[PDB]
Amino acid sequence: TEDQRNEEKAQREANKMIEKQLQKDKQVYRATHRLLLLGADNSGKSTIVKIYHVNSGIFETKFQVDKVNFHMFDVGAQRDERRKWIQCFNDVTAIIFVVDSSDYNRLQEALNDFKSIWNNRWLRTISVILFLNKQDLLAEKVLAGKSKIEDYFPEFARYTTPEDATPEPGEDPRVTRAKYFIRDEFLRISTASGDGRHYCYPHFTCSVDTENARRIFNDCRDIIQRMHLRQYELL
Amino acid sequence: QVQLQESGGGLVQPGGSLRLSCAASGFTFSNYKMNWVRQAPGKGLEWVSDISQSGASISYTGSVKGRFTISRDNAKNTLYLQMNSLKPEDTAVYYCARCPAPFTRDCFDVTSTTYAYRGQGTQVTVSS
Amino acid sequence: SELDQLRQEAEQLKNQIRDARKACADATLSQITNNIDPVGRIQMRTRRTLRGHLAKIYAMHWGTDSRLLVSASQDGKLIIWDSYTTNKVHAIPLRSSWVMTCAYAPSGNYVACGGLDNICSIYNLKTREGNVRVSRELAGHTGYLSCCRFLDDNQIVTSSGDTTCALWDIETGQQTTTFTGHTGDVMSLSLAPDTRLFVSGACDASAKLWDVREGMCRQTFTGHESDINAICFFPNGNAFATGSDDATCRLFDLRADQELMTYSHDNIICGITSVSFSKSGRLLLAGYDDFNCNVWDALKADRAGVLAGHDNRVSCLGVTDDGMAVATGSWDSFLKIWNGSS
Amino acid sequence: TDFRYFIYAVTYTVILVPGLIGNILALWVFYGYMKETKRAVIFMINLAIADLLQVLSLPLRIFYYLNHDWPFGPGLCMFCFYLKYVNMYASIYFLVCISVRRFWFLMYPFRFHDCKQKYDLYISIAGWLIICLACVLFPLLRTSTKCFVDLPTRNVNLAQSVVMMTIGELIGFVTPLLIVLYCTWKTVLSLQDKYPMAQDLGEKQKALKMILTCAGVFLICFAPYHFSFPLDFLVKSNEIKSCLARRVILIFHSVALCLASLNSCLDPVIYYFSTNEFRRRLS
Amino acid sequence: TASIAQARKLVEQLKMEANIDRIKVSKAAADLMAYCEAHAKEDPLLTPVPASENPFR
Ligand SMILES: CC(C)CCC[C@@H](C)[C@H]1CC[C@H]2[C@@H]3CC=C4C[C@@H](O)CC[C@]4(C)[C@H]3CC[C@]12C
Ligand SMILES: CC(C)CCC[C@@H](C)[C@H]1CC[C@H]2[C@@H]3CC=C4C[C@@H](O)CC[C@]4(C)[C@H]3CC[C@]12C
């Protein structure tokens, strides 16, 4: 069995070469944080972050914040039914959810999309970074008065601005009253489930807003840190 | 085979009342969350209301809140939608949609263009 | 008005088929197999643990030599394992990391994979350069690739999330036949032993039997209440088993054109991801969302045993061609090899 | 003198029961944890093993104080006496390792991956080997039926004794103390968010109180022992030669040594049974 | 205009499926039981082989 004896050694030597390559790939894989980009077509999710690549039917966006690599994936070439391929993103660092705040007609659909993603059995442990995009359009729509939010959401009639709200200087009280109403609609779903395994990070962003990359970095830092406190309790 | 038959509907004057019935077959009705979905002419499908497995949890769209009531009968394997004080903006084809999986809180693709577990739909017209 | 007319004629045809199936339902498989003795308790131990994947495993397929297998991970790597020694024979870096299926060619010279990239990539394992290279990229599907199976070195059948299945000519890169008729995402397919027919399970809770050469659907099988995630032919080719999200397994017969047996338990409330048969077909092994793999008695619908060796979702499993061992893949990034002992 | 015999006997019996129950049960849970989730608990296991051996050195030591006789031979005495202290500084070593590890993934979450735990087995092995080598002075410096507390101290020059005492304090207590305090201080800051989350459920607050408790027990237990150990050694060498100070220091060091021995049983409560992962495994 | 075209295809498919020959369930059940019996001995998972003949010792 001398001929067969060296055959096993050759196969075992090739195994070590593969293992060395896997360790090099493991370092890159865990040094990159993967994000799932979601939202409807009217939302400006494609322009949230100010290296962009299109691989097959998936729009890949790679950016670096404080020497940390983020790889954000957008899925474009799929059917409207997404209850199966959404399971492929069960191990992402966070989900980026973008909502058109000024679009009152489709605002309820965005809530239903958020509710299903939040309550999905394979997404129960993934935090969501919520970007309430197009705030400038929301301000103009409220100031104009042509469209009333209470027409679409009756709860807005008896809603009061939270005491913890921090409106920007020189902002109409009506605008920030409605700006935080839409945020609380998504936080009502967020705080009604999860059992502490994941949280939602609401943000107010506009079309001209170059700080969205920084906001994702800060939120994912808190997501990872909370993840470490849970899975590294016994060192 | 999963099949849903929507019954009821028709031409009703504005401000009238209308009751829709959904007959479920081919699956254990008590194990699934049920939804009501409508499609206005010239517009896509939109979610109207849902009811949990036991009926404890109920939700509505803000445009129909306070006017539509959704109920289910697990023993009768039937779903109901009471529509009173109707408006001409409610003229649409109403669909009985079942959530894809049992014993789940999420309901992903009920409001989709081609959904397998959604019935043929019933026509509701409110314009005088 | 014609659309309403055709809707009623379809119901009449469906009732005609339902009555025809009920007419030939003289007996039940449970009654026929009541007399035979049970298989007893099936105890299997983890002989091997395959470590190396950095992300959840989504698919595995044994080679025809019953020794080599290929497993697909979501980190972007294809690894070929020597199951006897746990040595890694190859590690193929994938251009797109969101792979959902993998297939081993019966000749052993090629492997296939594909996922959210809507592409079935063929890799040549026997090259003079000593490295694995992409030999073909099969484009044409408009949805994610859910399953693929080689017919030979030149033909492969792929199922996609665009509700269609396709037969591909690898040499020309074109799909010779397209199998349409599913109204939901096709999640799995299984080839008949003679490779003249194949069954596919979709998210419309139906299983369709397709003729490879003719290219049309011969029979449609209904009975599940949720999306079908797995399907596997019986070893003689006259039956197949499916697994759905309704926590049930059903055994359909091709010639009787109806369901024969249901494999479900009250404790089981989770979806089923993968199904396979033993060499004789007496055992049906099914993977579940509760991190366990239940071995069922196909004839008697009895849970023969449980494979509990994973800490996350069991995404795939498969039995070797000689029936010697069964491999189970899981979202915990590990593969395990199981067999019994005397 | 007579009190010191009784103080050790009473205290060591109190720690004997929870120390065995706390550490043996923890190791069984650690083995199950490694088999299930395949995640490293190297620092937790080594701390439990180091505490387990220290408790295991008590039953032989308790026998001496209840009989005033050591019929087991001088060879066994020099091992049981050496076993307790080699595991005391071993526990201190892995309390710093836990403190530095917690500081690493809470102050730099992005610079701590699964593969960052490389060269971790090389830390525990190196920690034991150097400690087991440097702690050999405990039986070497008292080698001269009397065992443990009654062992005579070797006649060593005062100048040479101070140098050894100074080095032992710096690398045995002073270095662990500053690192633990520094890691705890910055880890507390990183767990204090500028904008708290409304529905946070106090996940970080519980960690903040747990980490402060971990550093508090470290200061309460080991610091009094190392403030009397240099003084107690001079009493054995009769350098002080003061009647009043001789009785006070020996009794004070007896309490401090017993207090430092409490860390054998307090560690499972503070570190192991305070974790919600342990509750899931037990229940 | 689309819907009517899809309706014709679905009706046409049901005609093909309704014209197939179906055997009795008892006949189909017996064939499945017969195949399992004939190959029971050569099933390593059903009847585990001796450790000497098991490649995965
Ligand atoms: C009992 C006495 C000896 C304890 C001494 C504590 C010091 C010397 C030891 C204990 C834990 C050790 C640390 C453990 C982990 C790391 C992370 C590594 O990436 C750099 C080295 C570093 C930072 C070690 C430095 C030395 C260290 C801090
Ligand atoms: C003189 C003697 C008593 C000093 C103590 C030596 C022994 C008990 C210590 C020193 C090194 C320690 C080992 C260090 C590393 C590991 C690897 C870990 O995955 C399991 C625990 C284990 C295996 C420890 C077991 C206990 C150990 C072997």
Author numbering:
A (entry chain A): 9 to 58, 62 to 66, 205 to 253, 264 to 394
B (entry chain N): 1 to 128
C (entry chain B): 2 to 343
D (entry chain R): 15 to 158, 166 to 304
E (entry chain C): 6 to 62
What does the paper say about this structure?
Lysophosphatidylserine (LysoPS) is a naturally occurring lipid mediator involved in various physiological and pathological processes especially those related to the immune system. In human, 3 G protein–coupled receptors have been identified as LysoPS receptors, namely, GPR34, GPR174, and P2Y10. GPR174 primarily couples to the stimulatory G protein Gs, whereas GPR34 exclusively couples to the inhibitory G protein Gi/o, both of which exert their effects by regulation of cAMP level in cells. Here, we determined the structures of human GPR34 and GPR174 in complex with LysoPS and G protein by cryo-EM.
GPR174 binds the polar head of LysoPS in a central pocket through extensive polar interactions. Specifically, the carboxyl group of the serine moiety forms salt bridges with R752.60 and K983.32, and a hydrogen bond with Y993.33, while the amino group forms a hydrogen bond with Y792.64. Additionally, the phosphate group forms ionic interactions with R1564.64 and K2576.62, and the sn-2 hydroxyl group contacts Y2466.51 by a hydrogen bond. F169 and V170 of ECL2 participate in the formation of the central pocket by hydrophobic interactions, with F169 further stabilizing the binding of the polar head through a cation–π interaction with R752.60. The acyl tail of LysoPS binds in a narrow cleft formed by hydrophobic residues from transmembrane helices 3 to 6, including Y1033.37, F1524.60, M1855.38, and F2506.55, with the double bond of the oleoyl group in contact with Y1033.37 through a π–π interaction. Mutations to alanine at the polar interaction sites substantially impaired or even abolished LysoPS-induced cAMP accumulation, while mutations of hydrophobic sites like F152A and Y103A have similar effects. Furthermore, we observed an additional π–π interaction between the double bond on the acyl group of LysoPS (18:1) and the phenol ring of Y103, which may result in tighter binding. Unexpectedly, GPR174 couples to Gs in a noncanonical manner compared with the well-studied Gs-coupled receptor β2AR. Inside this pocket, F1193.53 of GPR174 prevents the formation of a cation–π interaction between R1163.50 and Y391 of Gαs. Overall, the GPR174-Gs complex exhibits a unique coupling mode characterized by the lack of R3.50–Y391 interaction and an unusual binding pocket for the C terminus of α5 helix, which may have implications for drug discovery efforts targeting this receptor.
